[PDB]
Ligand binder design. Structure first.
Ligand SMILES: Nc1ncnc2c1ncn2[C@@H]1O[C@H](COP(=O)(O)O)[C@@H](OP(=O)(O)O)[C@H]1O
Ligand code: NA
Length: 256
């Protein structure tokens, strides 16, 4: 196909929850668009100063009146600031803001990444939200400290998940609650976003449906990304603990 000059603004809003292939999708969108895609790893690795900004935004988010009202505009302005220079959103904390992002970026299309609910829960428990009594939680925390992440990082994860699930509080250690929230969330995205504007992706779908949806050619000779497995995250955590810096081990984790 011909090369065309793409606008550096949000073109793709991915509503998919953490552990549904968001990092692979981030990488895929960056391959297509040649501009950055937002993801929690963007915060971890490039923008830790954004943590307090997202926390503030979530704190004020209850005041969003679903469109435009005054306080809504103030919130939309901060969202647009956070996402300046990016061409897509994936993962927490952005995913729960999908309806709002649709208003802010009326010409953006929406994706929903999904998978088997139990595989999702298993993955979530290994990486994002281990149970309180799980010894592995201590290892995650130790590795995270090496990255400069503290309690405010976990607070952002918690609060952005509460926001996505529209719960005032949430028993994070309760598998049944999380499973119900996952199903309800995915159902609601599909009820809310007009089908013309939505593509539902299952893990393994690869380039074809995504590229068709976006009117772009399939990147030549480049496989669809498969990254961020829980096994890989376990190794990352262990290596951070072992070496006590990211820069010492980063050569071992390409595409991160
Ligand atoms: N192209 C692909 N095909 C199949 N699974 C993929 C994939 N890309 C990512 N995944 C899976 O998606 C999960 C990561 O999602 P996220 O990036 O949103 O945190 C991991 O699940 P597992 O932990 O079960 O391995 C990972 O293996
Ligand atoms: Na399986």
């Amino acid at each position: 196909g011909a090369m065309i000059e793409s606008s550096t603004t949000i073109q793709v809003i991915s509503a998919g929850l953490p552990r549904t292939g968001t990092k692979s999708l981030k990488n895929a969108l960056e391959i297509i668009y040649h501009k950055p895609c937002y993801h929690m790893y963007e915060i971890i690795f490039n923008k830790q100063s954004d943590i307090i900004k997202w926390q503030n935004l979530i704190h004020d988010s209850h005041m969003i009146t679903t469109p435009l009202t005054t306080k809504t505009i103030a919130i939309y302005d901060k969202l647009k600031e956070l996402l300046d220079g990016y061409i897509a959103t994936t993962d927490l904390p952005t995913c729960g803001f999908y309806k709002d992002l649709m208003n802010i970026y009326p010409n953006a299309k929406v994706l929903l990444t999904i998978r088997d609910k139990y595989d999702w829960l298993h993955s979530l428990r290994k990486v994002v939200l281990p149970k309180s009594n799980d010894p592995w939680k201590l290892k995650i925390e130790e590795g995270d400290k090496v990255l400069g992440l503290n309690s405010d990082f976990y607070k952002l994860t918690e609060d952005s998940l509460k926001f996505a699930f529209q719960k005032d509080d949430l028993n994070f250690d309760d598998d049944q609650v999380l499973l119900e929230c996952y199903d309800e969330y995915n159902r609601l995205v599909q009820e809310t976003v007009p089908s013309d504007r939505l593509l539902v992706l299952r893990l393994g779908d690869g380039w074809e449906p995504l590229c068709k949806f976006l009117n772009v050619e399939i990147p030549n000779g480049i496989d669809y990304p498969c990254v961020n497995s829980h096994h890989q995250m376990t190794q990352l955590t262990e290596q951070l603990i072992k070496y006590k810096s990211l820069d010492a081990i980063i050569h071992m984790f390409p595409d991160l």
